[PDB]
């Protein structure tokens, strides 16, 4: 509560590749950690225009921005000032797979992210390479502690142009930089939206809100 303010800033850089083709994106944003809300402006710095659906990146662009009730241990807020990191596999139904990591530190009232993103085996005719995704369906992440490690799993679905969905299995491992009390199992509802973008997604305005809860 002393290194976290009702209003916080975000600075990030993502370096990455999709199907072996490299790219980099930088972002700046704002958020309300206790309200579980955030927004950010993202700019493609290298490898533009991106030949893949931007939606594969958006959930990689911090569970600090999740509203936690009093009765659920908040692993993420408790991590700071030191911070935490996470690793995630995102396994898509057509065999496309993306691995991502984020190392999250704090400078003043500003979270700083170092992000790496690597996706392979997206088919040329699939909805990722053909840019036929519309948005992520609102989701519920399942958080749980196994073997002394905090994990989060979520069954995700992208809506597709013309209807239908393209599914993805998310598996995240979270790791605080210092000893932090582990939580009981719980859920975090997520809503994520690209609110605006330019023609080829070189500029993107991104919004998320998230709320933790005990029961389904």
Automatic annotation (TrEMBL):
Q: Which gene encodes it?
A: Dronpa
Q: Which residues carry this modification: Phenylalanine amide?
A: 61
Identify the residues that bind Cu(2+) 2: 207, 209
**Which UniProt key words apply to this protein?**
Chromophore, Luminescence, Metal-binding, Photoprotein
Report the InterPro entries cross-referenced here: GFP (IPR009017), GFP-related (IPR011584), Green_fluorescent_prot (IPR000786)
Binding-site list for Cu(2+) 1: 197
**Database matches in Pfam families:** GFP
**Superkingdom of the source?**
Eukaryota
Q: Which family, according to the similarity comment? A: Belongs to the GFP family.
Q: Which SUPFAM superfamilies match?
A: GFP-like
**One GO term of the biological process aspect:** bioluminescence
Name of the protein: Fluorescent protein Dronpa
Q: Which GO terms describe its molecular function?
A: identical protein binding; metal ion binding
């Amino acid at each position: 509560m002393s290194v976290i303010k009702p209003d916080m800033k975000i600075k990030l850089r993502m370096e990455g590749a999709v199907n072996g083709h490299p790219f980099a994106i930088e972002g700046v944003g704002l958020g309300k950690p206790f309200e579980g809300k955030q927004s950010m402006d993202l700019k493609v710095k290298e490898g533009g225009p991106l030949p893949f659906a931007y939606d594969i990146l958006t959930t990689v662009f911090n569970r600090v921005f999740a509203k936690y009730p009093e009765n659920i241990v908040d692993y993420f807020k408790q991590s700071f000032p030191e911070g935490y990191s996470w690793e995630r596999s995102m396994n898509y139904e057509d065999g496309g797979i993306c691995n991502a990591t984020n190392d999250i530190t704090l400078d003043g009232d500003c979270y700083i992210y170092e992000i790496r993103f690597d996706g392979v085996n997206f088919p040329a005719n699939g909805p990722v390479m053909q840019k036929r995704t519309v948005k992520w369906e609102p989701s519920t992440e399942k958080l749980y502690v196994r073997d002394g490690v905090l994990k989060g799993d979520v069954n995700m679905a992208l809506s597709l142009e013309g209807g239908g969905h393209y599914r993805c299995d998310f598996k995240t491992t979270y790791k605080a930089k210092k000893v932090v009390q582990l939580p009981d199992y719980h859920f975090v509802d997520h809503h994520i939206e690209i609110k605006s973008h330019d023609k080829d997604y070189s500029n993107v305005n991104l919004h998320e809100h998230a709320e933790a809860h005990s029961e389904l």
